[PDB]
Structure 1
């Protein structure tokens, strides 16, 4: 029975909820387990990056996040072809591939090609047969400076470009942002019936 002025609430505790309580005393021991399983991974892949392969510059979808840039799944096949990268040689030298990623845009396509010119120029490749050099492999001294990269390889920072201070021209001053919004709202909406009553007459 409710006492007085006080919030209405519906506690989700009507099931046998005590049997299925997940207590987090695993947590401090889990972080030890996940860390030892991360160092011993990195110690195996001895000169390779510890985060592993390079991820592409990728826009977030759905208009809340679409001004931000992530690390995606992997590079698209139209990003590997333009870079001169073979899709199955990509995985083996530490380049992320997914066959799924479309390309609706050229700038987001071209962003991930310049991304890969960096990597192949940054790539130190050790010969499979160590004591006999092969062609595509990097020089002897580049194998000797070879260290791991702790952190995501070519880390993705969202950068807005430097706009300067401008004297506002008599045209930009004169633009009516509110009415231009309110006009286009009606032109986006009512078009359907203005196309239909014009095809009529």
Structure 2
């Protein structure tokens, strides 16, 4: 029974919804349970950081977000291979690894091997048995400054290149950006049918010559 000018509404209540209403009075108590086991987690691994292993620098897919950078799952096996890290002594010193990743561009692959470089230097490795330090260990006086790292370890900053003002040349002044796009839009659409009409453009001569 609609009234005068209104909006045609379709509420999704024809089912029996009043049996599956999830209320949220957990929410204030849920946060406390989360926080009090997040601190107890850090208490267990006290010198190791709170966020955990470091993540790689990762672009986004889906050309809406591809100008942005996230923290991916783990470093690819090529990134670890260049950096000189065994992929099984990698997770032990807090370096997240997933072999499912590939490297389609060295511009990103070079960007993470630098990241594994700095983390490998900024790390203070404790000796396994203190009375017998190995070669990989750190300097004994550096162990005293072992404070736990809070927050995401080496946080990713989506920084842009600070460029400076230029003086426009005659070429940039005389470039038809709109028409070149409409041109580029047209070629990538007709490229197929132009090949086919050019395919038998040679077939209508070879029957002519003989």
Q: State the TM-score, normalizing by the size of structure 1.
A: 0.98
Q: How far off its partner does 1:130 sit?
A: 1.7
Tell me the equivalent position of 1:5: 5
Shift of 1:183: 0.3
Q: Quote the residue 2:193 is aligned against.
A: 193
Deviations 1:2-52 (A, max 9, x none): 111001110011111000000000000000000001000000011001000
Listed as ranges, the matches of 1:38-53 within 5 Å are: 38-53=38-53
What SS is found at the alignment partner of 1:88? coil
- Name structure 1 gaps, 5 residues minimum: none
The one-character-per-residue Cα deviations of 1:97-125 (angstroms, maximum 9, x if unpaired) are 00100111011000000001100100100
Partner of 2:58: 58
Distance 2:7 2:142 in 1: 67
Deviations 1:38-70 (A, max 9, x none): 000000011001000000000010000000000
2 CA distance for matches of 1:17 and 1:173? 64
- What is the CA distance between 1:132 and its match in structure 2? 2.1
CA distance in 2, matches of 1:177, 1:69: 29
Q: Alignment partner of 2:58: what SS?
A: strand
Q: What root-mean-square deviation, in Å, do the aligned CA atoms of Structure 1 and Structure 2 show? A: 1.6
> How far off its partner does 1:141 sit?
1.6
Distance apart, 1:135 and its partner CA: 1.1
In the other structure, the counterpart of 1:176 is: 176
Q: For residue 96 of structure 1, what is the aligned residue in structure 2? A: 96
Quick one: distance in 2 between partners of 1:90 and 1:43?
23
Between the aligned partners of 2:142 and 2:63, the Cα distance in structure 1 is 44
* Structure 2: gaps of 5 or more residues: 200-208
Q: Of Structure 1 and Structure 2, which has the larger fraction of its residues in helix? A: 2
Query: In 2, distance between residues paired with 1:137 and 1:187?
Result: 61
C-alpha distance in 2, partners of 1:34/1:63?
A: 35
CA distance in 2, matches of 1:117, 1:103: 18
| Matched residues, number | 201
> Equivalents in 2 of 1:10, 1:175: separation in Å?
52
Q: 3-state SS of the aligned residue for 2:149?
A: coil
How far residue 145 of structure 1 moved from its aligned partner, in angstroms, is 0.5
